[model samples]
Target: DDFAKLEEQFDAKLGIFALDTGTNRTVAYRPDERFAFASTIKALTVGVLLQQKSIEDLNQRITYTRDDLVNYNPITEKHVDTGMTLKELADASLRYSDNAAQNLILKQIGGPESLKKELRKIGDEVTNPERFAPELNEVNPGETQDTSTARALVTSLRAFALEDKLPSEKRELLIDWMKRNTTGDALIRAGVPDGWEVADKTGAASYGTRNDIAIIWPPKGDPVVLAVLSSRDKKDAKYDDKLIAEATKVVMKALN
Candidate 1:
């Protein structure tokens, strides 16, 4: 009933899944609906790459040229000629939500199918990725390049946050990168309590798809895994952002 009430306040269709790691309790609202994952899918790209290569491989340098440039990129806009490694690229992807860096990594590990294959190895078969950063402009109206449900995102976030399949060092690295992420700070982090941490990925897509998936850690409690995805008829919606923030505040207060 609370979830339905929460849904009625928004102007968009919403899917949410929040997990209390300590109590193993979960709350869901339309959690099975699949929406375009957008940049949030970067987490999967980074994870698959780490699973396929070593830290040494991640440290190897690759020079990027203007040809690699893509729109909505802040990482390369300031440093166009730098020889960036996979590690730094991953940081840029998560921290700045850099489109160019994501494309580079997507190409490095084969492609969308490769990442999906890797996810299958880890028991996730629900995420369907059909496009890369370069192809974002090509998506048609009412379409998504990558599609996933809230449950799928929460499952992936749990493995990324608390599970041991990914090396502890690499897992920490991913979380640390997310901690430094500045793009969606005003969305989910805006609702966070003092001294708590949120490692998350935000997805903005056409048709008002505004989404965030996070592993929130309270200073005095166990981590909470949450995913919220919303879609509307309009593009670049703002109300969905506030909905995420306010819902997070309520969830955090109750969980803590």
Candidate 2:
């Protein structure tokens, strides 16, 4: 009932999956379909970096210049000459979706291939990061690069939230960064009842791709990990934030 309306209204396809940690519940629609990772991968970029480097080391500044800037670099462009700590860069990428910070962080961590390997090591074998920021957002149909399944992303999120994928403090820091995200006000976080703890990363790209992966805490039960990925067939279609939000509400309501 819910998923169809969003699809019908926006003329888009929705792929979703969610897991209720406390009750062992699940809700899904086209959970295996691939969708562009977009900036959502920035969260994992930070996660992967923490896996290889210490949080303490994040304070060290990495330098860049005007040439390093990329589209959607609202944060990084300002800090170009000043440089930025790894922590600040990761924060901008995770919380603000700063494209330049993402590319810079990727460079520090050995670029796209390194993140791919670390994500696989953390059990996200289905995700592929083939290009740098902005470029990766150019999602071609049937393309295998820079994409992940709803199930795969949600599963990895569940692991990161409830398992030992990252150490306690590091995991908490990542979740904190996600909690502070300024991009998801109308995405998955908008669907759940207000005041529930929400730590989410949103991804928006070409083909009207708008995705949110989150770990939401209800008042009484354990956290729910969810992935809501939507895209229109039209190349020029604008994003429909409400579609992702409503899909989240549907999946969330079904779980409990």
Candidate 3:
């Protein structure tokens, strides 16, 4: 019934997938449909770096030039001349969804092509980010520059969390950064009741595309994986913060 309500409230095509880690039970709706990755791909970017490069590499300093700057990067605005470490750049990329910071990291890792290849190791072959943003153009209602299914995101995230591809310390580091993410408080996190912790990445794009992928830890249970994505026509679009929160609450109840 709540799913029906969500359908009525948001003028977008929705895709969702939630997995209960303890039981391997899943709740899914259009989970295989593709949508843009937006900044949510930053999470994967960090994971790729940790998997391919040594932990010591994260602390190494990298200079960032003005050319690296992009729109919506309040976090990188102060680092024009004074460069930062790879770890610092990762922090900015995830914590604030910094575009310029992402550009630098992507550059260091040999660009989106390399990241795409790394993701293929986890069976996620759909995400193809051609370049860092501000260079990114808005997509039409059903189009995208970089596309992925909710299932793909959940699969990759589970691999990072449960598999040994990334070292435990590095995995912990990435999860810590996600937990402190400064954005998306009003979306998925809003539906999580107090005492529960959630680590998530949020993505936004033109034409009212809003998405969030998260690992939610209940106070008394194993963590759950959830991803929600939407793409809407401008004429019927509205901000769907409540829509996302309500859907999350419904899933929480089902899992409980």
Candidate 4:
């Protein structure tokens, strides 16, 4: 379908995964290779935090201090000196892809390195050495994204979905959090119609690459865990998103 034609526009690699009924497979230049995690790491961080504490208390408002606000991005939101509940921040980070909210949560939950350690407890092979350091006031550019394979990422998500197998309920909590995810770029949203419950996140860095992880569940159908990552495209802005969308369509078609 030339679904990935857009990636050539930016010279990025395209990686994807499909998992259903406990089965998984990947197609990519580095199917088992690792790349920078970008904002995707937030998922793990949030999962670990929720596991440590009851995230159900929507009344707990977290004050966004100056330090909580990290480097700026076009999509980064600011409610400085104001406050949002822990629940709001969680949703903003995962659903809205809110960097500010994510950074704030990172600080409150002890930072990336700590979260990385927690991820390790879940058997996640990825590491964020400077995740909790003050020096990390600067975000890890794509040049140094936390590396992992599409299979690894989806595997973690799948474990999180059926967390008893991961030896904890935290994974279950994390999957539930993502199930409520609602923001980010629209490639996944465009891939399906209304009433489709596909929990996912999108990661985009410079160059032409775009990545997404989705735990797709139809209203009355089977569920699947999938990831789509694309890079090296030299096309228009919409071209890359469209390529991702097309890739998602392929995944749904092939796996569903």
Candidate 5:
């Protein structure tokens, strides 16, 4: 399946980057094109936390005022007056897509710029997260804020999930969180064959920007790392989850 067809079907730009870690096979379709990070940034933020901070740092509880909260804070809103531990915040941000929890984690690690610096230090010179959530999701056709390429993201994803970048305990925690992720049952997971494990983070934003980056393990083999990102030309275009699900199927075929 050609990516041009996918772009036509979705009425948007499509970027699909995939690496079959087992076979060392690579698939690239508009891989260098930048797309909004959305909640996907949370995955990288938490990865940085695990890479740089200690298990104790993750255990430390950080309280936040109501003013520190924002929209999409499902768990955070519940913990409003009484804040949550950093690990709980990670779960909320990843599994629940809690926006407030994400920002809180951002603050815990010194903010968006700190994440940017960490990414740079890790040799990923492409990804750049600009603003906090809600505002970060305010992406436009000409906007570069909080955006990165699929190639850059998948490389980072592979390092975080497959390659050596953090302690075994730290890496396993990230993988466990992604494997149990509850927010994206319809995207890459739905697209893959039954029984192939998918550890992923899903994201959505303005202009039908729906993104999922993951490590997909075949039932009988090693894993593949991928990023499927799409965005419509119109600012108010509605999201099409099917487009991403279908794109995932097509890309997996090429990789496997």
Candidate 6:
């Protein structure tokens, strides 16, 4: 596929695909295979938080103090601005890809173990318990919670689209929180032709790979979702951006 051609430039091992809501059709390669979650985990983390709490309570104000500033792993020790509410954290996690905001959500949502438990309850086995929970740190799969499949990623995205299938009000809150995830500046967003509403988030590691899930609401067609994970790239910046842009073009053209 032309999409793979784009990946070649980046020296990528890519896993990708899309699902059409109106037709219940999926087009994928290695959709069922797993890879690292990277920052993409924030989407699930935020979704779980919204499920457990309410987003409309305006009186709730979360404060960012010096204590809130915590260490960012494998990189900077500088603390980020805090004091944001559940909504703010969710927004930052999605829109800005804020690591501190994600950590805050992780803390609020009972850390990685809790997320893994929740996913398992829903039938999605997260790669490592150790990554999500400190208690599991000494366990095998330790600290590196590395594994995600395109299928599982799409399933979660579908859950967001079909949130009404949940327990009513909870569903709405999840949808609301999801609508806030805006950071798909890489593949998915660039791929879509302009004028479409693409609500998405991307997860990337400066030292490793790129992963993103995107939901596209067509101006006239049914909504669609896509998940793309590319790792071990040789860092061709052009291909890095083009991978996303071209993937979107392919998905859209396929839909047509």
lDDT of 3 by residue, 1-256 (tens): 6676787777567788899989999988888887776788889988988887788978899887777777776878897777889999999999999988888889888998888888887777766667677454355546545778898888888788656768798899889999999988998899899998989999887667788999998889888999988877683355677777878888888777
lDDT of candidate 5 at residue 232, scale 0 to 100: 86
Error of 6 at 170 (Å): 5.4
lDDT of 2 by residue, 1-256 (tens): 7787878887899998888778778898899999997888887788778777787999999999999997678888888778999999989998899999999999999999988888888778899998998899998789889999999988877676568887898898888989989989988888989779899999988899999999998787688889998888877889879888888878867876
- Model 2, 151: alpha-carbon shift in Å? 0.6
For model 4, the stretches where C-alpha displacement exceeds 4 angstroms are 1-11, 22-29, 56-58, 71-78, 127-145, 165-185, 193-195, 233-239
Each prediction's TM-score versus the true structure: 0.91, 0.97, 0.94, 0.76, 0.97, 0.79
Name the candidate, 1 or 4, with the larger TM-score value.
1
Candidate 3, 117: how far from true, in Å?
0.7
- Using lDDT as the measure, the top candidate is 5
Candidate 4 minimal-lDDT segment of 10 residues = 132-141
Candidate 4 local lDDT, 1-256, one digit each (tens):
3445544544456777677754543334346645445566567656655766664664588765666555542233456656788777777778666767777777776766677777677787754435431233223325344556677777776665555434455555566667776654477767865787767777765344467887777777667777776555342332257766767776666655
Could you give candidate 6's per-residue lDDT for residues 1-256 as a string of tens digits?
6666766766666777788988988778666655666666767776677666654652255655554444432211232343466665666666766666666677777877787787776666644433532222121221355467788887875674464325667555545555555556656777777788776777765334667786778788788888887665333332265665666677678776
Our tally of clashes for model 6 stands at 12
- The ten-residue window of minimal lDDT in model 5 covers 158-167
User: Residue 194 error for model 2, in Å?
Assistant: 2.1
- What does candidate 5's lDDT look like per residue over 1-256, in tens digits? 5778878877888898998878888888889998997888889999998887888878888888889888777889888777799899999988989999888888878899998999998889998888998899988776787899999999987777667878788888999999999989999998999988889999999888999999988877888889998888888899888888988888877875
lDDT of 3 at 160: 84
Off by over 4 Å in 6: 56-59, 63-67, 70-82, 126-144, 164-182, 233-239
Tell me which of candidates 4 and 5 scores higher on lDDT: 5
Using lDDT, rank the candidates from best to worst. Answer: 5, 2, 3, 1, 6, 4
Quote model 5's TM-score.
0.97
Error of 2 at 118 (Å): 1.3
Q: Report RMSD (Å) for each prediction in the order shown.
A: 2.2, 1.1, 1.7, 4.5, 1.1, 4.8
In the range 1-256, model 1's lDDT, one tens digit per residue, is: 5555666788677788889988988777788887888788888788878777887888888788888887877876666777788888898898888998898898898888888787777778888787778455233344545788899988986785579668888888788888778878767788888788888888887767778888888787788898888777566555457878877776666665
